[PDB]
Homo-oligomer: A and B are copies of this chain.
Amino acid sequence: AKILCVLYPDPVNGYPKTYARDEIPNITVYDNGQTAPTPKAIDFKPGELLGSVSGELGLRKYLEGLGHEFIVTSDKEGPDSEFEKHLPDAEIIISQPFWPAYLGPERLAKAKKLKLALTAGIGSDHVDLESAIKHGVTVAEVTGSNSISVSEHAVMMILSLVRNYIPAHEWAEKGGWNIADCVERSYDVEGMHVGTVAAGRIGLAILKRMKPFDVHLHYYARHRLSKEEEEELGLTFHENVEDMVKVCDVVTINAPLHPETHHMFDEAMIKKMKRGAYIVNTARAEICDRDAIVRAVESGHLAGYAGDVWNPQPAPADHPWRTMPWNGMTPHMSGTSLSGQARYTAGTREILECWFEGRPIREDYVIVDGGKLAGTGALSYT
């Protein structure tokens, strides 16, 4: 059928001629024991840029290797768009969260022939998980691929906030020194209290990583961890997120976006956070109330917020977070480092393979199949 794939604009220097490196580490196995994607053939050197229009997830050889139709495009907005154009007769839709072709109920209505909305990466929140059920449609996402990538992003975005990196940097770039104005905001993270919403692949990664920084490790999930996990890391479990946000000076959000978590960090929850506390949100923007976050920083109740997730995506030029005080922001770039691109593209292939050769699709990669939250969907999403 028509496979349709929404990928991001190429670099403004055009698709990369050469890269900064000759290769990247080979990664085969994850922490919880899960294996890295296992496609039979890949048609790209890992470490290459697969996630833009030109990269095309190195898929064009395999898909027009059964002479299927394979369209690629960054144009994805409103009903005149290239995406909206090819949408109705498409059977497999592929997009990445970094550049998400959203699939609400009406965009689901128009897609007459859609059988598999396939998230290249993690978090299928851009997809109306209910509607999907109504139309029998199947939804799968490359679970694990880029969780370690994100974890590195978060930790980094923590130290950048607590130590006030970006600003001090902003000085030295423009000729200055200004030490004194640098370290008025600069605290060690050491012996602070730090809190992960969720302790899934990311939240557990982040914890394992902050532990050697001699901080006191707290966390909310809906089920506890093992004892030997909780002891080896030396955690402090919290039933309420309320509970946790009172004691923690740093909170990392690391939970999926579904209606439980919608606006969890609204002005409501911001109350109980300690003055000068910090939020790293690498999970999904809509877990925070945008206009709440802003104020609590402007107000000064929050020392800082940083994150790579926004809403919508792209976020509008005028999105307050961008310019907001002490923002440690980036575009949505953690899941799609070259290192992680390697894995979610593989998986993207793997998942197409089993679908095209009739064979099954890993439990782990499946969010929705056959009208119910199955596999990862059942444990993580609502």
Contact = CB atoms under 8 A, between A and B. Distances in A.
Given A8-B179, A166-B166, A300-B20, A25 B191 contact: yes
Task: Tell me the number of copies of this protein.
Answer: 2
A169 interface: yes
Given A21-B303, A152-B188, A159-B152, A171 B275 contact: no
Interface in A227-270: 249
Interface stretch (A310-318, A354-362, A372-380): A310-318
A165 interface: yes
B165 A160 contact: yes
Contacts of A300: 20
Contacts of A317: 175-176
Contacts of A162: 152
Contacts of A42: none
Interface string A163-177: 111101101110111
B339 A51 contact: no
A52 interface: yes
A183 B341 contact: yes
Contacts of A13: 181
Per DSSP, chain A at the interface is: loop
Contact of A24 (B21, B176, B187, B336): B187
A12 interface: yes
Given A24-B191, A188-B148, A212-B209, A163 B153 contact: yes
Given A49-B180, A49-B184, 8 more contacts: A12-B178, A22-B275, A149-B190, A155-B155, A183-B333, A187-B339, A209-B212, A212-B212
Give the 8 A-B residue pairs with the shortest CB-CB distance, closest first. Answer: A25-B191, A175-B317, A156-B159, A188-B339, A21-B276, A177-B314, A20-B276, A11-B181
Interface of A: 8-13, 16, 19-22, 24-27, 31, 47, 49, 51-52, 98-99, 148-149, 152-153, 155-156, 159-160, 162-166, 168-169, 171-173, 175-192, 208-209, 211-214, 249, 275-276, 300, 303, 308, 313-315, 317-319, 322-323, 327-334, 336-341
